[PDB]
Design a protein around this ligand. Sequence first.
Ligand SMILES: *[C@@H]1O[C@H](CO)[C@@H](O)[C@H](O)[C@H]1NC(C)=O
Lengths: 49, 48
Amino acid sequence: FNCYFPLRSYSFRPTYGVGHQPYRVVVLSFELLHAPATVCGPKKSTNLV
Amino acid sequence: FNATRFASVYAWNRKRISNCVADYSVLYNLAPFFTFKCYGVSPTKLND
Ligand SMILES: *[C@@H]1O[C@H](CO)[C@@H](O)[C@H](O)[C@H]1NC(C)=O
């Protein structure tokens, strides 16, 4: 009574409809800031003018 | 609850409830142990 286990399982089944098929999500977070950049796009440099 | 029943296995009795203030905290004294299974709504937040 008023005691619950928070963990529940999806139990995915292919026979389920569109709203129950499992989906894989990858969330990318960037941080545009004044600090020096480590990761950068694939672009070609040029001589200093 | 706390009332007589009819042989409604074939013909379930339907009660329409409207225009009232509903409380569920009193339904926890039905028996020493009973199932309060819920589908589609979490057991909590029912009042809200
Ligand atoms: C139902 O009856 C039992 C025993 O008579 C009592 O303990 C309980 O409070 C009652 N519940 C309601 C909702 O009247």
